[PDB]
């Protein structure tokens, strides 16, 4: 199970998920979060293997962009922002944890609009839908 | 139950550029832990000559590729480089430059200035994030 450390989290120390939840990151291509995981893995591999960089590697990241991230989703978020609809900022992610057991869910990024993180009521319906998903996951 | 998590992008300080905003007239892009570019909205002219030489800059070979690759890809999507410094200005074409600048950050101003600076804890509220450069690239 992929885990997140305290150096890549704010106000958190060790908050991490199951492998079966992260398994959705190579099947569905409408998730806003898996791009961050891919960037983190690329960063770890680059700083580990390629040693002693000579003042940054601009071409390496220029070429990894075409291979790791979803440019269509980034352009979709940009178009949504310039057209004044709640969009994504790539910094806040919400999920469910089911504290009784421990099984969790893949986060969906928060909705930002007008420079204010709109509250849980304004998208609460989505919450319920995902809950139904875990209902379908109860069996 | 619902929980929220926020990601610290400064772990990408190497191998990825980072950007964050300070005021509506100032923006900062950062490469490494010592060098970055200031994107400043202003109504003050710094250079006069109307000739930007960029091929000569790369032919100089006394420069840093990482610093000016970003301004190159900004130009793709006047200048004065004497002495090795970096200084680009766009005078006010306006729609494109403002759209690119707003793309980084994700009127009554005459100039936008790109210049070299040393890293400081500049941006107050907006945390660094690499999404802007991934969008421009």
């Amino acid at each position: 199970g992929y885990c997140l450390t305290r150096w890549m989290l704010i106000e958190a120390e060790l908050k991490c998920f199951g492998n079966t939840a992260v398994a959705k990151c190579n099947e569905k291509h409408d998730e806003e979060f898996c791009d961050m995981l891919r960037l983190f893995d690329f960063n770890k591999q680059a700083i580990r293997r390629l040693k002693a960089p000579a003042q940054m590697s601009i071409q390496l990241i220029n070429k990894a962009v075409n291979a790791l991230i979803n440019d269509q989703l980034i352009m979709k978020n940009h178009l949504r922002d310039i057209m004044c609809i709640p969009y994504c900022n790539y910094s806040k992610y919400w999920y469910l944890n089911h504290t009784s057991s421990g099984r969790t869910s893949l986060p969906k990024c928060w909705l930002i609009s007008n420079g204010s993180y709109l509250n849980e009521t304004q998208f609460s319906d989505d919450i319920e839908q995902q809950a139904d998903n875990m209902i379908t996951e109860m069996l | 139950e619902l929980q929220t998590l926020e990601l610290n992008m400064e772990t990408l300080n190497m191998t990825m550029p980072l950007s964050c905003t300070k005021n509506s007239s100032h923006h900062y892009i950062r490469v490494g832990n010592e060098t970055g570019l200031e994107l400043t909205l202003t109504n003050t002219s710094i250079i006069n000559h109307k000739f930007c030489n960029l091929s000569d800059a790369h032919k100089k070979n006394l420069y840093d590729h990482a610093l000016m690759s970003i301004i190159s890809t900004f130009h793709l999507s006047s200048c004065d480089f004497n002495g090795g410094k970096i200084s680009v200005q766009y005078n006010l074409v306006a729609n494109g430059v403002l759209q690119t600048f707003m793309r980084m950050a994700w009127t009554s101003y005459q100039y936008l200035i790109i210049q070299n600076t040393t890293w400081e804890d500049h941006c107050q509220f907006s945390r660094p994030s690499p999404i802007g450069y991934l969008g421009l690239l």
Partner: antibody
Amino acid sequence: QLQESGGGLVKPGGSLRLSCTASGFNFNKYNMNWVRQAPGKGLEWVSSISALSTYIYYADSLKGRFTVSRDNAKNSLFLQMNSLRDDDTAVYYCAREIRRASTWSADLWGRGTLVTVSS
Amino acid sequence: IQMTQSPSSLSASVGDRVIITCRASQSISSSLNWYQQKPGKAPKLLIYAAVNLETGVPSRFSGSGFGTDFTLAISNVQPEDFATYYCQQSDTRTFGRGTKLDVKR
């Protein structure tokens, strides 16, 4: 290494300048700070200055009395103390701060300069 | 933000492990630095980020903690390990009082 100078003895109500000189690294890009130690007491932060003297932070117990400046031509850091009182005698250090793990830390210090105030 | 240090003093005989604690009013996440000063000498950094060890340090010097409680553990006390210690917040840059260490007889 960092070399510290300017200390001595000054009567109450006077003023003083302290110099701290850096050699062995690129002084241009580094945050700097001034730290204090009283006789028999613990350490005490005094002031902090950024790379291009753009952000300056001070301790609240003495705000409005000390001025921190740096001339990067000589790699020099000066602290001006004004209106010296009886409790302004101590040993002073200039430390080089560093930015790691989204957190500041001082990983290089000097020797120590003695400032005494007495009538 | 208050930075209370414990204890005032403690004595350790050679060949023992000791614990020194730093508490604060607010949750500062993990921003705490552990320094050691010798009598008449400029202090030297031991621990940054409350978990990390600096270049050129004995491996027994360990640090841990989070939130409002932090603790430094010294595993194998040695003759050059009798000094004074300071815990410092890095966000607001405030020092502590100090814990002294001496040989026990």
